[PDB]
Amino acid sequence: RWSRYIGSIHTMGFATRPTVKPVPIGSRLGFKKSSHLVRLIDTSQDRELGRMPEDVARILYPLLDYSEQVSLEPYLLINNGKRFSVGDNIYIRIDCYLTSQAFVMDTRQLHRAGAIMALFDAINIQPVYALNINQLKSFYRITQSAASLQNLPETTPDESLFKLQLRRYQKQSLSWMLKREYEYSHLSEKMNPLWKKFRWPSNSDCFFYANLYTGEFSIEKPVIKTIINGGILADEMGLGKTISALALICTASYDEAHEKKIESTDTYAYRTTLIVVPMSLLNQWQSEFEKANKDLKKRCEIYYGNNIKDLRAYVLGPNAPSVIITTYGIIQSEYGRTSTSGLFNVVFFRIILDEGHTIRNRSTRTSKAVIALRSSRKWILTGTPIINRLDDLFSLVQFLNLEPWSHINYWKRYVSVPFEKGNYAQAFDVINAVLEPVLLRRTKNMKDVDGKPLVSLPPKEVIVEKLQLSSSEKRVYQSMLEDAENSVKEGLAKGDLLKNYTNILVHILRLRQVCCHLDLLKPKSSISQDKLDALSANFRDIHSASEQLPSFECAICTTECIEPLSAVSITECLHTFCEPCLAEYIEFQQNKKLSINCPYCRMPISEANVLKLKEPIDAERGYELISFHSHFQSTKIKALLRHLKQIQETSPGEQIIVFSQFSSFLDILEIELRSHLPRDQVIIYKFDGRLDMKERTRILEQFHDKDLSCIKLLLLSLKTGGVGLNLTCASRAFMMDPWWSPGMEDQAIDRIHRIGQQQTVKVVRFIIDNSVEEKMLRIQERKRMLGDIVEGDEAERRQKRIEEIQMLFQ
Ligand SMILES: [Zn+2]
Ligand SMILES: [Zn+2]
**Are 335 and 372 within 8 A, CB to CB?**
yes
Q: How many angstroms separate the alpha carbon of residue 604 from the centre of ligand 2?
A: 9
Q: How many angstroms separate the alpha carbon of residue 554 from the centre of ligand 1?
A: 5
Cα end-to-end span (Å), the chain: 99
Q: Count the Cβ atoms, other than its own, within 10 Å of residue 667.
A: 15
Q: How many angstroms separate the alpha carbon of residue 556 from the centre of ligand 1?
A: 5
Which numbered ligand comes closest to the C-alpha of 568? Answer: 1
Q: Is 285 helix (H, G, I), strand (E, B) or coil?
A: helix
Taking the C-alpha atoms of residue 573 and residue 289, their distance in angstroms, rounded to an integer, is 47
Q: Is 513 helix (H, G, I), strand (E, B) or coil?
A: helix
Of the candidates 545, 594, 542, 593, the residue with the CA atom closest to the CA atom of residue 570: 542
**Are 726 and 699 within 8 A, CB to CB?**
no
Hey, what amino acid is at 231?
Answer: G
Q: Where are the alpha helices (DSSP H) in 401-466?
A: 408-411, 417-420, 424-435
* Breaks in the chain, after residue numbers (C to N greater than 2.5 Å): 34, 104, 129, 190, 204, 265, 522
CATH 3.30.70.640 assigned to 529-543+550-627: no
- Sign, Cα dihedral of 238, 239, 245, 251: positive
Q: Which residues pair with residue 73 across a beta bridge?
A: 95
Taking the C-alpha atoms of residue 173 and residue 245, their distance in angstroms, rounded to an integer, is 9
Q: How many angstroms separate the alpha carbon of residue 618 from the centre of ligand 2?
A: 26
Fold of 169-187+230-402+438-442: Rossmann fold (3.40.50)
- Sign, Cα dihedral of 593, 599, 605, 606: negative
Is the peptide bond between 564 and the residue preceding it cis, with omega within 30 degrees of 0?
yes
Taking the C-alpha atoms of residue 669 and residue 660, their distance in angstroms, rounded to an integer, is 10
Q: How many CA atoms lie within 13 A of 187 on its CB side?
A: 18
Establish whether domains 529-543+550-627 and 635-807 are of one fold. Answer: no
Helix (H) or strand (E) holding 279: none
Written in H, E and C, the secondary structure of 69-107 is: CEEEEEEECCCCCCCCCCCCEEEEEEEEEECCCCECCHH
Hey, what amino acid is at 751?
Answer: R
Range 296-299, long-range pairs (CB < 8 A, 24+ positions)? 298/250, 298/253, 298/322, 298/323, 299/323
Residue 760 DSSP one-character state: P
**Are 454 and 444 within 8 A, CB to CB?**
yes
Taking the C-alpha atoms of residue 485 and residue 26, their distance in angstroms, rounded to an integer, is 116
Of the candidates 320, 362, 369, the residue with the CA atom closest to the CA atom of residue 343: 369
Taking the C-alpha atoms of residue 184 and residue 175, their distance in angstroms, rounded to an integer, is 10
Report CA-CA distances (Å) from 394 to 140, 406, 432, 576, 623: 16, 7, 13, 46, 35
Helix (H) or strand (E) holding 764: strand 761-768
Q: How many angstroms separate the alpha carbon of residue 530 from the centre of ligand 1?
A: 29
Taking the C-alpha atoms of residue 532 and residue 627, their distance in angstroms, rounded to an integer, is 9
Determine whether the annotation assigns residue 294 to a binding site: no
Which numbered ligand comes closest to the C-alpha of 609? Answer: 2
Taking the C-alpha atoms of residue 314 and residue 378, their distance in angstroms, rounded to an integer, is 21
Q: How many angstroms separate the alpha carbon of residue 582 from the centre of ligand 2?
A: 11
- Angle at CA of residue 719, ends 714 and 724, nearest 5°: 65
Which string of DSSP letters, residue by residue, matches 677-739? Answer: S-TTTEEEEE--SSS-HHHHHHHHHHHHS--TTSEEEEEEETTTTTTT---TTEEEEEE-S--
Q: How many angstroms separate the alpha carbon of residue 627 from the centre of ligand 1?
A: 19
Resolution of the experimentally solved model in angstroms: 3.6
Strand-strand pairing, 323-326 and 268-276: parallel
Q: How many residues does the chain have?
A: 810
- Sign, Cα dihedral of 58, 62, 64, 67: negative
Q: Count the Cβ atoms, other than its own, within 10 Å of residue 591.
A: 8
**Are 749 and 707 within 8 A, CB to CB?**
no
Which residues have C-beta within 8 Å of that of residue 417, sequence separation ≥ 6?
Answer: none
Strand-strand pairing, 38-42 and 761-768: unpaired
Q: How many angstroms separate the alpha carbon of residue 605 from the centre of ligand 2?
A: 8
Which numbered ligand comes closest to the C-alpha of 557? Answer: 1
Taking the C-alpha atoms of residue 582 and residue 612, their distance in angstroms, rounded to an integer, is 12
Q: How many angstroms separate the alpha carbon of residue 587 from the centre of ligand 1?
A: 15
Chain-centre distance for alpha carbon 304? 22
- Angle at CA of residue 152, ends 188 and 441, nearest 5°: 135
Q: How many angstroms separate the alpha carbon of residue 565 from the centre of ligand 1?
A: 12
Written in H, E and C, the secondary structure of 103-167 is: ECCHHHHHHHHHHHHHHHHHHCCCCCCCCCHHHHHHHHHHHCCCCCCCCCCCCCCCCCCECCCCC
Helix (H) or strand (E) holding 626: strand 625-627
Phi first, then psi: what are they for 374, rounded to 5°?
Answer: -100, 135
Q: Is 384 helix (H, G, I), strand (E, B) or coil?
A: coil
Report CA-CA distances (Å) from 490 to 478, 562, 800, 805: 19, 61, 20, 14
Hey, what amino acid is at 394?
Answer: F
Q: Is 582 helix (H, G, I), strand (E, B) or coil?
A: helix
Taking the C-alpha atoms of residue 90 and residue 72, their distance in angstroms, rounded to an integer, is 17
Taking the C-alpha atoms of residue 697 and residue 693, their distance in angstroms, rounded to an integer, is 6
**Are 399 and 406 within 8 A, CB to CB?**
no
Hey, what amino acid is at 311?
Answer: L
Q: How many angstroms separate the alpha carbon of residue 533 from the centre of ligand 1?
A: 26
Of the candidates 303, 299, 360, 301, the residue with the CA atom closest to the CA atom of residue 331: 303
Report CA-CA distances (Å) from 101 to 78, 97, 201, 205: 33, 11, 19, 18
> With 0-12 CB in 10 A as exposed, 13-18 as middle and 19+ as buried, what is 489?
exposed
**Are 239 and 442 within 8 A, CB to CB?**
yes
Q: How many CA atoms lie within 13 A of 697 on its CB side?
A: 4
Taking the C-alpha atoms of residue 265 and residue 279, their distance in angstroms, rounded to an integer, is 41
Strand-strand pairing, 196-199 and 730-735: unpaired
Q: Which residues pair with residue 276 across a beta bridge?
A: 326, 353
Q: How many angstroms separate the alpha carbon of residue 593 from the centre of ligand 2?
A: 20
Report CA-CA distances (Å) from 496 to 493, 500, 791, 802: 8, 9, 21, 10
Chain-centre distance for alpha carbon 595? 47
Determine whether the annotation assigns residue 241 to a binding site: yes
**Are 170 and 164 within 8 A, CB to CB?**
no
Taking the C-alpha atoms of residue 535 and residue 551, their distance in angstroms, rounded to an integer, is 18
Taking the C-alpha atoms of residue 333 and residue 370, their distance in angstroms, rounded to an integer, is 11
Q: How many angstroms separate the alpha carbon of residue 566 from the centre of ligand 1?
A: 13
Which residues have C-beta within 8 Å of that of residue 721, sequence separation ≥ 6?
Answer: 744, 747, 748, 751
Q: How many angstroms separate the alpha carbon of residue 610 from the centre of ligand 2?
A: 11
- Angle at CA of residue 355, ends 353 and 359, nearest 5°: 75
Q: How many angstroms separate the alpha carbon of residue 577 from the centre of ligand 1?
A: 6
Of the candidates 262, 378, 257, 248, the residue with the CA atom closest to the CA atom of residue 318: 262
> With 0-12 CB in 10 A as exposed, 13-18 as middle and 19+ as buried, what is 491?
middle
Taking the C-alpha atoms of residue 226 and residue 773, their distance in angstroms, rounded to an integer, is 59
- Sign, Cα dihedral of 76, 79, 85, 87: negative
Taking the C-alpha atoms of residue 518 and residue 506, their distance in angstroms, rounded to an integer, is 15
Taking the C-alpha atoms of residue 317 and residue 662, their distance in angstroms, rounded to an integer, is 60
**Under the phi-then-psi rule, with left for phi > 0, alpha for psi from -120 to 50, and beta for the rest, what region is 548?**
beta
**Are 733 and 465 within 8 A, CB to CB?**
no
Instruction: Give the neighbor-by-neighbor strand order of the sheet with 268-276.
Output: 300-302, 323-326, 268-276, 347-354, 375-382, 230-235, 439-442
Taking the C-alpha atoms of residue 195 and residue 209, their distance in angstroms, rounded to an integer, is 7
Q: Count the Cβ atoms, other than its own, within 10 Å of residue 567.
A: 16
- Sign, Cα dihedral of 363, 365, 370, 374: positive
Which numbered ligand comes closest to the C-alpha of 569? Answer: 1
Q: Is 806 helix (H, G, I), strand (E, B) or coil?
A: helix
CATH class of 5-123: alpha beta
Phi first, then psi: what are they for 654, rounded to 5°?
Answer: -85, 125
**Are 381 and 353 within 8 A, CB to CB?**
yes
Which residues have C-beta within 8 Å of that of residue 322, sequence separation ≥ 6?
Answer: 249, 253, 254, 271, 272, 273, 298, 299, 300
Hey, what amino acid is at 117?
Answer: M
Phi first, then psi: what are they for 75, rounded to 5°?
Answer: -130, 145
Chain-centre distance for alpha carbon 668? 30
Determine whether the annotation assigns residue 239 to a binding site: yes
Is the peptide bond between 222 and the residue preceding it cis, with omega within 30 degrees of 0?
no
Which numbered ligand comes closest to the C-alpha of 585? Answer: 1
Q: Dihedral angle at the C-alpha atoms of 102, 108, 112, 113, nearest 10 degrees?
A: 100
Which numbered ligand comes closest to the C-alpha of 601? Answer: 2
Determine whether the annotation assigns residue 235 to a binding site: yes
Determine whether the annotation assigns residue 238 to a binding site: yes
Taking the C-alpha atoms of residue 70 and residue 575, their distance in angstroms, rounded to an integer, is 72
Fold of 635-807: Rossmann fold (3.40.50)
Q: Where along the chain do its domains lie?
A: 5-123, 169-187+230-402+438-442, 469-520, 529-543+550-627, 635-807
Of the candidates 84, 109, 78, the residue with the CA atom closest to the CA atom of residue 10: 78
Q: Is 463 helix (H, G, I), strand (E, B) or coil?
A: strand
Q: Count the Cβ atoms, other than its own, within 10 Å of residue 148.
A: 7
**Are 414 and 124 within 8 A, CB to CB?**
no
**Are 212 and 116 within 8 A, CB to CB?**
yes
Q: How many angstroms separate the alpha carbon of residue 570 from the centre of ligand 2?
A: 9
Report CA-CA distances (Å) from 134 to 138, 140, 202, 700, 706: 6, 10, 48, 19, 10
Which numbered ligand comes closest to the C-alpha of 600? Answer: 2
Helices 282-290 and 241-251, axial angle in degrees (round to 10): 60
Which numbered ligand comes closest to the C-alpha of 582? Answer: 1
Q: Provide the total of helices (H) and of strands (E) in the chain, helices listed first.
A: 24, 26
Written in H, E and C, the secondary structure of 195-261 is: CEEEECCCCCCCEEEEECCCCEEECCCCCCCCCCCEEEEEECCCCCHHHHHHHHHHHCCCCHHHHHH
3-state helix, strand, coil split of the chain in percent (to 5) is 40, 20, 45
Phi first, then psi: what are they for 157, rounded to 5°?
Answer: -80, 145
Phi first, then psi: what are they for 211, rounded to 5°?
Answer: -125, 95
Taking the C-alpha atoms of residue 542 and residue 570, their distance in angstroms, rounded to an integer, is 13
Range 557-563, long-range pairs (CB < 8 A, 24+ positions)? 557/581
Q: How many angstroms separate the alpha carbon of residue 575 from the centre of ligand 1?
A: 12
**Are 725 and 737 within 8 A, CB to CB?**
no
Chain-centre distance for alpha carbon 233? 14
Which string of DSSP letters, residue by residue, matches 596-610? Answer: P--TTT-----GGG-
Taking the C-alpha atoms of residue 668 and residue 807, their distance in angstroms, rounded to an integer, is 30
Taking the C-alpha atoms of residue 372 and residue 274, their distance in angstroms, rounded to an integer, is 13
Chain-centre distance for alpha carbon 123? 45
Which numbered ligand comes closest to the C-alpha of 571? Answer: 2
